[PDB]
Amino acid sequence: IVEGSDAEIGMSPWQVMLFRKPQELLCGASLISDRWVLTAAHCLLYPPWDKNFTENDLLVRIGKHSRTRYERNIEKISMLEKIYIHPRYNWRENLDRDIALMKLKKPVAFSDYIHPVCLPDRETAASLLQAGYKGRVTGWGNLKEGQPSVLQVVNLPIVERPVCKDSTRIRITDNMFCAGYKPDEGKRGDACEGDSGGPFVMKSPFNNRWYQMGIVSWGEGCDRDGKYGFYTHVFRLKKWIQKVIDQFG
Amino acid sequence: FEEIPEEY
Amino acid sequence: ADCGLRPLFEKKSLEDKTERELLESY
Ligand SMILES: N=C(N)N1CCC[C@H](C[C@@H](C=O)NC(=O)CN2CCC[C@H](NS(=O)(=O)Cc3ccccc3)C2=O)C1
Ligand code: NA
Ligand code: NA
DSSP states (O other), X not given: OBSOEEOOTTSOTTEEEEEEOOOEEEEEEEEXXXXXXEEOGGGTEEGGGTEEOOGGGEEEEESOOBSSSOOTTTOEEEOXXXXXXXXXXXXXXXXXXXOEEEEESXXXXXXXXXXXXXXXXXXXXXHHOOTTOXXXXXXXXXXXXXXXXXXXXXXXXXXXXXXXXXXXXXXXXXXXXXXXXXXXGOOOOBOOTTOTTOEEEEEOTTTOOEEEEEEEEEOSSSSOTTOOEEEEEXXXXXXXXXXXXXXXX | XXXXXXXX | OOTTOXXXXXXXXXXXXXXXXXXXXX
């Protein structure tokens, strides 16, 4: 995260760390039930970079605060049972449908530091996914286009689709939204390397619940003027999400 | 990274 | 069910230090 600040203890209890058993931080992820994690497909599979992670290559770490300490009595580390990538994920061109589900080997237990985020309903999505409304991104990724000691947080405004489109050469899909301040705004912030797969969440003003609207997906550099971070559009892919849990867990 | 339990 | 209600904030009626910035934008 660039230009963010340290998270408060238990501020983002659905925040998950995708950890490679070299033992390294792959990406964030989010807890949506006691057995299901949501992340970016590219965190697992990106053939251009020769990245194709399997169930047995990874570990999921939940309830974490610190990036590197093993937080004895606080975090829980699970083994994956199965990985599901969106059948139409487009890794060949624009990371369209950049989403995967990981089903844990065993249901995790909730605690002050571990709690699932909600998935939006069409109507939550309809009223919140508006240009200028702010969401929150979290992660342990780079601080600069080094690495934080604790979880970072940044609040960012959703930007109008045209503005998104006109900032890049990549073709933008209905499955993506972009967020960030405009050069004029004199407020910065962005996700950065290592933040991928983390949650873009918003707090509903109707029921005071936190909803995960986006997934950290792609961008070009970190916190560049006139550029914006791009996120997977969770609601547009919710059908696929339900389909898998239902058809399998 | 501080090492993690081996049981994991 | 209990999704998105944080044990240390919502469940205790405490606010995190920047959540008003979100609500204020809506
Ligand atoms: N939010 C911003 N600004 N981003 C920039 C800082 C990396 C951040 C996430 C990061 C992983 O942790 N995601 C990526 O690496 C996804 N990805 C994979 C390949 C390279 C690509 N970036 S790019 O090459 O500049 C432009 C591009 C985007 C999509 C597909 C191919 C090209 C990219 O963004 C995303
Ligand atoms: Na363009
Ligand atoms: Na920018």
